Swiss-Prot record, chain A:
Record-given protein name: Major capsid protein
Organism, scientific name: Human herpesvirus 2 (strain HG52)
Role this protein plays: Self-assembles to form an icosahedral capsid with a T=16 symmetry, about 200 nm in diameter, and consisting of 150 hexons and 12 pentons (total of 162 capsomers). Hexons form the edges and faces of the capsid and are each composed of six MCP molecules. In contrast, one penton is found at each of the 12 vertices. Eleven of the pentons are MCP pentamers, while the last vertex is occupied by the portal complex.
Parent-record interval covered: 1179 to 1276 of 1374
Subcellular locations according to the entry: Virion; Host nucleus
Family affiliation: Belongs to the herpesviridae major capsid protein family.
Coiled coil: none
Stretches that traverse the bilayer: none
Subunit structure: Homomultimer. Makes the hexons and eleven out of twelve pentons. Interacts with triplex proteins 1/TRX1 and 2/TRX2; adjacent capsomers are linked together in groups of three by triplexes, heterotrimeric complexes composed of one molecule of TRX1 and two molecules of TRX2. Interacts with scaffold protein; this interaction allows efficient MCP transport to the host nucleus. Interacts with capsid vertex component 2/CVC2. Interacts with the small capsomere-interacting protein/SCP.
Curated annotation (Swiss-Prot), chain B:
Protein name: Major capsid protein
Subunit structure: Homomultimer. Makes the hexons and eleven out of twelve pentons. Interacts with triplex proteins 1/TRX1 and 2/TRX2; adjacent capsomers are linked together in groups of three by triplexes, heterotrimeric complexes composed of one molecule of TRX1 and two molecules of TRX2. Interacts with scaffold protein; this interaction allows efficient MCP transport to the host nucleus. Interacts with capsid vertex component 2/CVC2. Interacts with the small capsomere-interacting protein/SCP.
Native source organism of the sequence: Human herpesvirus 2 (strain HG52)
Residue span relative to the full protein: 443 to 491 of 1374
Location within or outside the cell: Virion; Host nucleus
Known function: Self-assembles to form an icosahedral capsid with a T=16 symmetry, about 200 nm in diameter, and consisting of 150 hexons and 12 pentons (total of 162 capsomers). Hexons form the edges and faces of the capsid and are each composed of six MCP molecules. In contrast, one penton is found at each of the 12 vertices. Eleven of the pentons are MCP pentamers, while the last vertex is occupied by the portal complex.
Swiss-Prot record, chain C:
Gene: MCP
Main function: Self-assembles to form an icosahedral capsid with a T=16 symmetry, about 200 nm in diameter, and consisting of 150 hexons and 12 pentons (total of 162 capsomers). Hexons form the edges and faces of the capsid and are each composed of six MCP molecules. In contrast, one penton is found at each of the 12 vertices. Eleven of the pentons are MCP pentamers, while the last vertex is occupied by the portal complex.
Native source organism of the sequence: Human herpesvirus 2 (strain HG52)
Span within the parent record: 1130 to 1178 of 1374
Subcellular location: Virion; Host nucleus
Protein's name according to its UniProt entry: Major capsid protein
Assembly and interaction partners: Homomultimer. Makes the hexons and eleven out of twelve pentons. Interacts with triplex proteins 1/TRX1 and 2/TRX2; adjacent capsomers are linked together in groups of three by triplexes, heterotrimeric complexes composed of one molecule of TRX1 and two molecules of TRX2. Interacts with scaffold protein; this interaction allows efficient MCP transport to the host nucleus. Interacts with capsid vertex component 2/CVC2. Interacts with the small capsomere-interacting protein/SCP.
Family: Belongs to the herpesviridae major capsid protein family.
Superkingdom of source: Viruses
């Protein structure tokens, strides 16, 4: 059929709304782009990882997934470039980008 | 709907900052300001102890 | 809790519990105290979509 895709799994709470994932949405749960920057000094580390604040894409709740969005969460420890648990395998990690 | 396919949810627990402020009990301008144009006693029963 | 124009509760041990339970995470939750002369200053989130 063609090139093999690679499907990477991320743990989520079972009580996340399935209205989230009907839209373009983040697999890490908290929208973290530098396009959402507010031209502060270190805004996008706190746009990504500060949880007193709220998600820019969903302003009313902070995260959609607490195991992924947070620093030192389970989503972070697997797929971050600093920790590189999937750093030896030549298979492409799709979530290495996120 | 907001500016998207986002469905948005009000859910009265959001209203906890509006009504639980302690101006709900502040009625001094209410009872005192309306207390002009006095209507006479229309035979009170449960208004007296 | 941004703007004050009303008396608070008399039990101040009740007033802070009513206030720090609302304020503690809002998008519109005020600063550290409110100023006497000044504004609530409404602390900014790092981004908005």
């Amino acid at each position: 059929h063609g090139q093999d895709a690679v499907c990477e799994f991320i743990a989520t709470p079972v009580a996340t709304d399935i209205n989230y994932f009907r839209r373009p949405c983040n697999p890490r749960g908290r929208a973290a782009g530098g396009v959402y920057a507010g031209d502060k000094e270190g805004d996008v580390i706190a746009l990504m990882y500060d949880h007193g604040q709220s998600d820019p894409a969903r302003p009313f709740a902070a995260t959609a997934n607490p195991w992924a969005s947070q620093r030192f969460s389970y989503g972070d420890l697997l797929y971050n470039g600093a920790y590189h648990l999937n750093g030896a395998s030549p298979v492409l990690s799709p979530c290495f980008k996120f | 709907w907001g500016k998207d396919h986002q469905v948005l949810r009000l859910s009265m627990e959001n209203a906890v900052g509006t009504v639980c402020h302690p101006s709900l009990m502040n009625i001094d301008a209410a009872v005192g300001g309306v207390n002009h144009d006095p209507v006479e006693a229309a035979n009170p029963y449960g208004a007296y102890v | 809790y941004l703007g004050r124009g009303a008396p608070p509760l008399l039990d101040n041990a009740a007033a802070v519990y009513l206030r720090n339970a609302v304020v503690a995470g809002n998008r519109l939750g005020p600063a550290q105290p409110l100023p006497v002369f000044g504004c609530a200053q409404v602390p900014r989130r790092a981004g908005m979509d």
